[model samples]
Target: EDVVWRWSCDNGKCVKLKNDPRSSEPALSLEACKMFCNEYGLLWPRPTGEADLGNFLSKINLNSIEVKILKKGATDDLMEAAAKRFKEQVSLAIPRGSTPKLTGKAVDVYLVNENPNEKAFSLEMDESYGLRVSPSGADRVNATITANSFFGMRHGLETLSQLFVFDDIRDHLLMVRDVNISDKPVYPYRGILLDTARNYYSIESIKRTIEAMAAVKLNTFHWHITDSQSFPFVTTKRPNLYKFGALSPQKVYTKAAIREVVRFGLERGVRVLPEFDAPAHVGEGWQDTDLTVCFKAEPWKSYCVEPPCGQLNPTKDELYQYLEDIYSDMAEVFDTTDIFHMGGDEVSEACWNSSDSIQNFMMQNRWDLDKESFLKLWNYFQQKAQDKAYKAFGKKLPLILWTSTLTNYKHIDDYLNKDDYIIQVWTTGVDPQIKGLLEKGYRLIMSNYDALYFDCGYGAWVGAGNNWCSPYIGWQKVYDNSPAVIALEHRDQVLGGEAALWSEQSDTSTLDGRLWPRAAALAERLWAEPATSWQDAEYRMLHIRERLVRMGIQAESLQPEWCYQNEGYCYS
Candidate 1:
């Protein structure tokens, strides 16, 4: 049987070669192998090393593959999913040949450690794995994935998937016949913040996001679940919050949906850390409740930075209990992560000044009606909120705050306990702010708006005006953002960063285009080897874009298929 010589494009077009010499490149060069791994894209972010495993000289028969879990109670679900997905991916991506369907006589996966219930941040959840593959000749190809936990096993499976390639010369399937890989992420907390408040995303869309995050080994899903635009998170404690504040009940996330989303993320080894923006960005959701004040009359003024200027009324004692109940409800829904985001950013001065009763409380505390005194007032509210959270859960949970919480007040550190917080740096160009927080003995997550905010650049939503000024962040800029922005001394305090997707201009229709390919850049930055260059990243991601699209993510393509095939030929 003669094997046809051809070049295939992602759009299903193929070009034939009439008289090329097959032996000239029987073993595809590393560059050719990269372009040929159509099912998995260029090993984006690039692995640590391939050593002698440069090209594929043999193939593996998929039908004979065998997967086994050596550990007790080890679930075969993840490994099985990987194999099934891999086979389907090849069938769709690889062009059919003249050879009969080759049956894999055998392939074995031994998961030495498979702790599916292990949380993300623990030492035991280290997603490091070793993969060794030897070509056929001894019954069949032999391969094993060894890891400390399920997350590591998932990473190993992804790595192994990327190892397979199509052998056009022999007209059969192919993979690097021999190779060994010991892989792990550079940062444990690789995350993406999906804002559901500005625009609602269906449960399916959120699950799709989780699946994509898992493909790249991103472990954290910072769900900016609620904010100023609308309160779509349904809670039994306050049914009115979603009823009145959401665009409609149809848009609200029910308790059952929340649980399902968390489970979906957990199965993929991603932690769903829910955020409830408070003090500011609360909007009118709390107006119907007594927990907040200053919204009964005409102007409806309070201290939130967004419209209607509302904040939880610091002077009201009942508000603390309300917070306790809400936190308890949250604890019930999102039990995966130990951290909860208390959004304390951009409080308004005029809103608080509008109330004489707030003034009276400040006066009693010996604070003047000034910015310094106002933050101290905010400090009081934040401390109480934290205390209530502890009371509800019967133990302390790590809290995450926006940069403004520390930046807005003088001596804010004195009011908040350093051990209880992990500050997310969102304000643009605030290297000093991040450094100062680290100096104060606080840990941090970098979401620096200038480099990492994915919500920027796209024009505002249809109803919303064009008030946004930030430009679109290209993939290179996202990859270039160094996690160690501060001096070397404080770099260790950086827990890793999340690429934030604020939804003012985003919804289900726009999420895939908005988050993918670009976010993969950040993924590689956080998970792959250091010193990897974007030049190499360019080739790697070109292939990855195709993989994402096949996996059901509508990832934006960075370049044409011709560019992928020719490499630098077109440029020259």
Candidate 2:
């Protein structure tokens, strides 16, 4: 590398240099200036608590770093897991090579409390931590991360990773000095939903998704694992579901495979949530049986939300029994099973009306085969299935349902109790059902289609133009969406939100592009709930995007080099 008098950020703040100070207003061999200055590595999902910025420490060689974990007694596997995870992440950021000039050691995390729920990943688990990196002003710099629990220790480790930037000019890592960051997320239920049924994603792909989720501090990975098009969640208990429904044998996720993903999630502090999406969004999985009605019904629009229409035959005792088996396996496999997403979103009444046995059963019971009867039938299925699920898990798990007709204000109280069910709103944010549900005191996870859906703007599969959620949703829209503001006085009812990608046009290859950079936007919104808008977050957003690419995630690009090189210049 040739030494040159090139301008860079002035002393780690974005002031272009005029002359080399050997360096304040630093001149460098390469352009060290970036969109974010002062703030360490421009952390994504910006910390909820204080993050003191502006102090750039002396650069350090990746080789000189050491990790020394100190936990009082009976060493926790999770704490050790975090140390190993952190070291691996550090190695990934920069290659392991000894740089003769730079040196620093960055470790010594104190796990103060094992916490009451270390073994269980739950909503109540503490995820708060404090981190400080002080300037030693010598070859050995010191840093300490203090965590309340093992899970929070994982988060603290993640934050520590974010504080480093690979200094291209020096070919080493740069971290902030004189740092004090006390952080925790604003919402307990930060998540992302990946719909695997529409187009199956391999286990490796799913693990990659979890990897990105953890890196962004997203605590939940909601797996929309099955649908009318395919059933990829293979269980030993019901081998036929995957045997008959999978697009191909290789496309399915076997029980062991799913458990591996769960273990992977547990290690990363992300809860892998399985969504059976029952009573509807089910078909192929229950083939060679009369347990389902309207399977692959023609003119899908009439009987279902999309092609290959299908809905479980709610009137059957067998259907409930089948669900129990599925729920039982999920309860055992997942690291946490306190909450379940029973995707009840677009349950079609027309599908049920098409069945004679269903209609006859209603008639024999002296009940009219009308909306009321069908609704009662749906309610009946939910009640029985929930009971069976509770029995299988040996406890009453908080069931989650998508916003649907059963959740309509008039009849919601009749069937779904706010105490037992959590409503995940998938409709547009302004829909009346949102306010109604909140007023009824229902807890919610906002996945408002207009802003949080990532599968939008793609070229339609049915036709040539853009998809239903067209024109596209930019990161700005995602960052601007406020769940708390939407809830108004019932803000307390909002648990958090999720960014969902229904894979009608996406699979393993396109998944990263479809979700990233934009998903990180939602991550920050749910994590910090910053009072300001995207304008304040744009620069940091760009920085995190670059880091995502470095971590082997092919996150979609949002801007050109010109725009990135000149941070505040390209706003319209």
Candidate 3:
């Protein structure tokens, strides 16, 4: 190896030296400096660099670091807590039993803000910030983070933490490299959907997931709290909802537990959007309620997705009141956002058609009792639910529905208005559906099952028989997806996409493994600039995966350490 100054490691032992391990006065290449940065790695969601000054801090002393909050509003806790966590991580990055090389004055970290009142977290919160790192003469440094909101300050803190790399050669000293970053996310709604109904994830596991999501600047945790397989969310209005629906009494999330999850996500600036998917994908939750007609009553004839096909009977008026009660309860408990997912997907016509009472009721209303009749009934159901949300909560709740409601019903224009809803496109042929929705002026969140479905790939769990065609989506495929393929004018209507972990093949044991690093791929895509290449991303992701693992996320690696060591060998 002719390289003058380089880093080499063997059997868990590392060495960085000049000329050679046995020599000095090394002539290093710009490639070598970049290799040093690339090898040691830097921040994720790569910052916008107007200029690369080619400077390095070489050393940073955590003991000399001081965090100053200039404007303390309702964000006192958030800002101070972020500072504390940053310091703690820095302490962890400092190799064991190593002291600061430059022991002199303190490094001033200023959190200067123009507004203190703009600290509250919201779904559409501005999380943009400017961070500057410069040397204050020898043995000292000055860092400043300026943001309009606490969320941006939190992001700035995360970027600052990433700048400190553990240098094994420098006796384990933490090195905070010099850089200037004026960064903000590419999309506001970077999210991950965890289906807690199919498999219960503990509150601790959920919190850990939130922690990982925050690490990569992901801002939303879409809690798919209940489904057809199980109703694991306990409700006060309907304790029996989970009492019978849950696998057991202990296998469900209590109201207190639900509140705890919400609080945990909020503290990290990750909004928790709870989804109680309805009108379909309901099982024991609808067992006793008149809302469902065919419950475990079978000669086994239905188009429903699951066994003993169940759905909320749209014809009944009381179903609206029940939905209102549950949603109102959810609103009070979640208490964070006004957006609620009113699942209008997979409503089996067999369940509605097989019931003679429903057919008779449809005829009584002067209807044909066909799919169009079902569509009209569903539209009425949706309107009723929306109206009740306003009546109960004193504010109109923005509803989210699946693509099925728009596609299956030909009478979509007559009943549903684009303004009242945000369509979540999860079905196949997503591009056309997205184009159609955007053309109609409806905002959307893309979850296109083909690329973003994490629970696919794995073979049929509980004999669902490969609903997604059993094709695994590698991280590269996730990175390759361009969420903004629409016209530049209609691009704003495309609110970011989410990686959906349906959880039939995943639980706490497999959750972290399934979601991480891969989900981080989508994280970067949604957060970083559009021009960011996957090849460059692949290099950064290698380091990010290690960070996630260190944070106790059980994040799976895309390639082995040897592949990183040998570089490009894994490709061929």
Q: What is the clash count for each candidate, in the order shown?
A: 5, 0, 0
Query: Can you write out model 2's per-residue Cα lDDT over 48-165, one digit (the tens) per residue?
Result: 7877855454576666666666655433666667677775676554534423335554443444544524557676778888878776544666667777777787888888777665
Clashing pairs in 2: none
> Whose lDDT is greatest here?
2
Query: What would you estimate as the lDDT of candidate 3?
Result: 0.72
lDDT of each: 0.70, 0.78, 0.72
Per-residue alpha-carbon lDDT of model 3 for 1-572, expressed as tens digits? Answer: 23344544333222343545555643333222333445324567776543233445455555777889898787687677787777766654543445546544457788975566665445577888898887778767778899888888888888777766554344334444466678888777889999998888877899999989988899889888888778887777867777888878888888798788887777677888888787777767777677786666464454565565677777777887777777777777777665777777877777878877788888888888767678766666667877876765577666778888544334455766777777787866345666766777777787888778887776675455565546888888788776765325677877788899987778888999989888888888888745655776676787778778778778877898765544445664
Model 2 bad stretches (over 4 Å): 1-25, 28-41, 72-75, 92-117, 136-138
Candidate 1 lDDT tens digits, 443-487: 778888888888887655433654364688888888878776442
Off by over 4 Å in 1: 1-32, 35-41, 48-54, 74-100, 114-124, 167-171, 293-308, 405-410, 460-469, 485-487, 569-572
Model 2 lDDT at residue 525: 94
Least lDDT summed over 10 consecutive residues: which range in candidate 1? 8-17
Task: Return the lDDT, model 3, position 402.
Answer: 82
Highest TM-score model number: 2
RMSD versus native structure for model 3: 4.1
